[PDB]
Design an enzyme around this catalytic site. Structure first.
Site, PDB file in Angstrom:
ATOM      1  N   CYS A 152       0.824   0.568   2.668  1.00  0.00           N
ATOM      2  CA  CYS A 152       2.190   1.124   2.184  1.00  0.00           C
ATOM      3  C   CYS A 152       3.280   0.696   4.443  1.00  0.00           C
ATOM      4  O   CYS A 152       3.534  -0.546   4.611  1.00  0.00           O
ATOM      5  CB  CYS A 152       2.006   2.338   2.679  1.00  0.00           C
ATOM      6  SG  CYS A 152       3.659   2.906   1.921  1.00  0.00           S
ATOM      7  N   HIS A 169       4.974  -0.921   2.104  1.00  0.00           N
ATOM      8  CA  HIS A 169       6.224  -0.575   1.834  1.00  0.00           C
ATOM      9  C   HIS A 169       7.312  -1.453   2.250  1.00  0.00           C
ATOM     10  O   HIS A 169       7.413  -2.387   3.471  1.00  0.00           O
ATOM     11  CB  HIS A 169       6.322   0.735   2.118  1.00  0.00           C
ATOM     12  CG  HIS A 169       6.812   0.736   1.423  1.00  0.00           C
ATOM     13  ND1 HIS A 169       7.621   1.466   2.115  1.00  0.00           N
ATOM     14  CD2 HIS A 169       7.021   2.114   0.380  1.00  0.00           C
ATOM     15  CE1 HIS A 169       8.759   2.071   0.604  1.00  0.00           C
ATOM     16  NE2 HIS A 169       8.273   2.298  -0.542  1.00  0.00           N
TER      17      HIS A 169
HETATM   18  C1  73D Z   1       3.717   5.336   2.978  1.00  0.00           C
HETATM   19  O1  73D Z   1       2.516   5.806   2.129  1.00  0.00           O
HETATM   20  C2  73D Z   1       4.550   4.613   3.690  1.00  0.00           C
HETATM   21  O2  73D Z   1       4.229   4.588   4.691  1.00  0.00           O
HETATM   22  N1  73D Z   1       6.166   4.285   3.674  1.00  0.00           N
HETATM   23  C3  73D Z   1       6.582   4.363   4.916  1.00  0.00           C
HETATM   24  C4  73D Z   1       7.279   2.905   4.844  1.00  0.00           C
HETATM   25  C5  73D Z   1       6.222   5.132   2.620  1.00  0.00           C
HETATM   26  C6  73D Z   1       7.722   5.537   2.312  1.00  0.00           C
HETATM   27  C7  73D Z   1       8.244   5.795   0.964  1.00  0.00           C
HETATM   28  C8  73D Z   1       6.559   6.123   0.064  1.00  0.00           C
HETATM   29  C9  73D Z   1       5.626   5.551   0.566  1.00  0.00           C
HETATM   30  C10 73D Z   1       5.574   4.923   1.514  1.00  0.00           C
END
Ligand code: 73D
Ligand code: 73D
Ligand code: CL
Ligand code: CL
Lengths: 187, 187
Positions: free
Chosen positions: B105, B125
């Site tokens: 993410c 992400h």
């Molecule tokens: C995820 O866990 C995370 O780190 N982000 C930030 C970019 C994000 C954004 C939306 C859903 C999950 C996540």
């Protein structure tokens, strides 16, 4: 007004099945209470993740009723839920008021234990089918999520996002569920 | 011998991205240490789930090295990891010994902060892409899981099972990953 969810957290709960619905429902703007079956202390889940509940079940019940009551799975978690008089009372009350009840994996076997939702179409984890179907009080489904009126069931860790989003859709509508889903990077 | 995983848990970590890999790796027989960045106390994750770490990072580091170091996402969790000198040291050591590093993410943005794995193909992400790509030190991928040698990255909550199973496959092999996957009821 904001919808409210009670997630009942017992020793041996499947932590993924606990955390994914809590997180996803909070993303949907639902006020979620993680309620400890045994009291206020941290709960050792099935794979040894330790979660601190927001409140004891005893205390959370006083703030009811809730728009959904959620039962995670995990064999030992589900057994603890199934054996609980407090859970029996909560589910009976919820069924009586036509409130949503949601259960995943072995979680739906607590519905059997507490005589909730008989006649419903339900799913469970494949390994929990025979237990759930003892007496033929439900009709069995292999759908990843099964919603029959106010009884919403699902199969396992790998169906937890679908389960959570079905709860969201039931409480807050299709469009909110779609909005919450898109940033999750689901297949 | 059993493989060992260090999962670094910071305030504001995405709880789903923390719990799914911990649980799945434990299913695979991996010895997992959930290590609190800030010390031994419970950690408030991004959506307010509170997890009690197995140990402080300070203490877990003494039991290293590990076959994988895992960085959950969550913006604020990733920022805390990115700002940590202790994390810098752990990742540098891991890279130097040719040990696996796994991040999901916003988690991979800590690799950037600590100058780890430059030249690798990575994913994040979608919302973290621009941050990760600042300076063009990596090549960007939209694959749900990207494994480039010993840098393993993934996109979000909805890719967490795939991410976890890729870690399992890397450490314990394809057949163990398949065995662990089947009971999860993944699509
Ligand atoms: C995820 O866990 C995370 O780190 N982000 C930030 C970019 C994000 C954004 C939306 C859903 C999950 C996540
Ligand atoms: C699930 O969480 C659960 O309750 N069970 C027992 C049937 C199970 C089995 C295998 C994987 C997940 C779960
Ligand atoms: Cl279980
Ligand atoms: Cl976040």
């Amino acid at each position: 007004a904001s919808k409210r969810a009670l997630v009942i957290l017992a020793k041996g709960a499947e932590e993924m099945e606990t955390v994914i619905p809590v997180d996803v429902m909070r993303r949907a703007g639902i006020k979620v209470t993680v309620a400890g079956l045994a009291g206020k202390d941290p709960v050792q889940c099935s794979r040894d993740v330790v979660i601190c509940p927001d409140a004891s079940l005893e205390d959370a019940k006083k703030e009811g009723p809730y728009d959904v009551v959620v039962l995670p799975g995990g064999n030992l978690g589900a057994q603890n839920l199934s054996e609980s008089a407090a859970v029996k009372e909560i589910l009976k009350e919820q069924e009586n008021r036509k409130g949503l009840i949601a259960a995943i994996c072995a979680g739906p076997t607590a519905l059997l234990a507490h005589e909730i939702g008989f006649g419903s179409k339900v799913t469970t984890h494949p390994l929990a089918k025979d237990k759930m179907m003892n007496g033929g009080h439900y009709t069995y489904s292999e759908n990843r999520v099964e919603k029959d009126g106010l009884i919403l069931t699902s199969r396992g860790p790998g169906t937890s996002f679908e389960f959570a989003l079905a709860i969201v859709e039931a409480l807050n509508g299709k469009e909110v569920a779609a909005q919450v889903k898109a940033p999750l990077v689901l297949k």
